[PDB]
Amino acid sequence: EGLIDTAVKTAETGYIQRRLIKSMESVMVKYDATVRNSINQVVQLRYGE
Amino acid sequence: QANQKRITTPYMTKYERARVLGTRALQIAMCAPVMVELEGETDPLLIAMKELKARKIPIIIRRYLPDGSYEDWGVDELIISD
Amino acid sequence: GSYVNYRHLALLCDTMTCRGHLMAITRHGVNRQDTGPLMKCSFEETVDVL
DNA sequence: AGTTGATCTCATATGGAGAAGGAGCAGAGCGAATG
RNA sequence: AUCGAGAGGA
DNA sequence: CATTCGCTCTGCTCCTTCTCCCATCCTCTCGATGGCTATGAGATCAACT
């Protein structure tokens, strides 16, 4: 059962990792210290808070 | 944007330090004049780091703001954190 | 008992909620944003997006 | 201004999850016709 | 050389 | 003139349909794909004079 879980869990977790990156890859701290996406919409007014 | 009220942080970012050092090293390798005395150091990147600590690098950083304005800061105006 | 710094969770939850509705981390969310078509095509639905 | 010859070219013979469309159908309410 | 298949490594 | 009746128009389920996606990188071997003969007419223009 441990060998099966080690072989089967990996596709689901790696797909989750991909989808997260593709959802957030352009989100950046700007020089005004706001956090914005590529369409320049405000996600956070200060990083973290 | 008026230059009398620059609002970006007075500290140099890690990314600014990285690119300033790279650009200046490439300039020194292309025989740009060196703004510091050399203790016989010959590596363009070591020379660039000497000029950085001396505040002598002749480069302006143009910080673009999200609204499309910018601030120009000299490398000698910024606080170097490393 | 694992720990992740709050700002990472906060930024994911804000990404999922900044549009005023629950945006899924799936083509049905991510590829329905105003992001440009080249960004969308790098994820999923590559040819239909274009 | 007139004459030659390669060469091409036709043609011959024998799992699952979400999203979208349609049909069913209930029933609201509008307007004509009473009764 | 390509396409496909199979067997392996972390 | 107060129904009443009939007819049009939503909009709420429950299918059928269909389209999408399924960790990263690396090594090796093996099978398969793998395409007439020839003689004629006849148009082109490269190229001799």
Domains in chain B, start-ordered, CATH in brackets?
1-82 (3.90.940.10)
Would you say the C-beta of A7 is within 7 Å of strand F? yes
- Resolution of the experimental model, in Å, one decimal: 1.9
The values of phi and psi at residue B63, to 5°, are: -85, 110
- Closest by alpha carbon to B67, among A45, A26, A31? A31
- Closest by alpha carbon to C32, among B62, A23, A10? A23
Report residues 2-41 of C contacting strand F, contact meaning Cβ closer than 7 Å: 27
Cβ neighbours, 10 Å, residue B5: 7
CA dihedral C10, A17, C4, A49 (to 10 degrees): -20
Interface probe with B: pick from A32, A37, A42, A43, most Cβ of B within 10 Å: A32
Single-letter residue type at C27: R
- The helix/strand/coil state of A13 is helix
Alpha-carbon distance values, A38 to A42, B22, B36, B40 (Å): 10, 27, 41, 47
Count of A-C CB contacts under 8 Å: 45
Method: cryo-EM
Instruction: State the Cα–Cα distance between residues A17 and C16, nearest whole angstrom.
Output: 15
Single-letter residue type at A8: V
Helices (H), B1-82: 14-29, 44-54
Instruction: State the Cα–Cα distance between residues B74 and B50, nearest whole angstrom.
Output: 17
